[PDB]
Design a protein around this ligand. Sequence first.
Ligand code: GTG
Ligand code: SAM
Length: 260
Amino acid sequence: VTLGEVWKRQLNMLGKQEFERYKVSDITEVDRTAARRYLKEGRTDVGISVSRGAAKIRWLHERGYLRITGRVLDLGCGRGGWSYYAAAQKEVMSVKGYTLGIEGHEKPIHMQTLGWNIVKFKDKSNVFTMPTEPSDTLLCDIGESSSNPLVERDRTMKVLENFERWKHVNTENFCVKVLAPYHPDVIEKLERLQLRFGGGIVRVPFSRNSTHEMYYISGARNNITHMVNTTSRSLLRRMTRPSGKAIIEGDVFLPTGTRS
Ligand SMILES: C[n+]1cn([C@@H]2O[C@H](COP(=O)(O)OP(=O)(O)OP(=O)(O)OC[C@H]3O[C@@H](n4cnc5c(=O)[nH]c(N)nc54)[C@H](O)[C@@H]3O)[C@@H](O)[C@H]2O)c2nc(N)[nH]c(=O)c21
Ligand SMILES: C[S@@+](CC[C@H](N)C(=O)[O-])C[C@H]1O[C@@H](n2cnc3c(N)ncnc32)[C@H](O)[C@@H]1O
């Protein structure tokens, strides 16, 4: 029915090699070699990011989609890539990161990058069961992929309901992952949230062609439906004519040390 529904069906039909070629086609990508090399040797002192995910929040911040300010809540922080990026920013006073930590390599990793001493992590935290707390900047990077679009729809709606709960009057800045934005129920929900909170939706170019994820952000106003369909059309175009090639750029590097 929607363009994004056509995209998901066709994606699931792709052959193994077609899939691998398509997923990286014309996407942007950070080179993670330096970070991985330093992490393998346990070098927590060096100015590197713990995850690939940090490239998404840098693009959001640097391109004017998101201000990062005051007390920041990082929901679904995982390793801490968004938390440590935030801690390094001028206007930030503290970061609190919450994550399930269901798997070992998805638990917070301590670093000594700038402002590490103003970050607190709590793993074994379900942000859906816990009471909300005030924030000036609310981040949420939750949404597990599924080949089943109905599963992805439910996951997305669950994340958006909890976001509305966590989103306080209080909260000026926000960035929330919308796993599968193309579902009519998801669009209708985002539209009512936009009436309440403002903002708009953006597609981060570091996302792989194999997911339709977009981000609901405070920093811009735009038409939800127009933005989602434009992404759907881009992803379909890339499928019929796949370059099989990502544009590689430099990773997220950080200053190091404590902040007062
Ligand atoms: C395998 N597969 C999937 N689809 C379809 O594509 C969608 C996206 O999932 P896809 O596996 O990229 O991503 P995830 O489900 O999130 O898994 P995963 O690799 O575990 O990604 C999650 C984790 O990977 C981590 N990650 C980051 N960088 C890398 C990396 O460079 N390599 C790997 N393996 N993981 C990375 C990242 O941090 C994140 O936590 C699925 O829903 C299906 O519709 C397929 N379709 C066809 N036709 N053929 C296929 O073989 C096929
Ligand atoms: C995409 S990862 C976070 C990546 C992170 N922004 C980074 O750059 O390192 C999403 C994380 O959210 C966590 N998560 C999923 N559901 C959650 C829940 N209900 N409460 C807290 N964390 C959750 C997952 O365990 C996963 O590690």
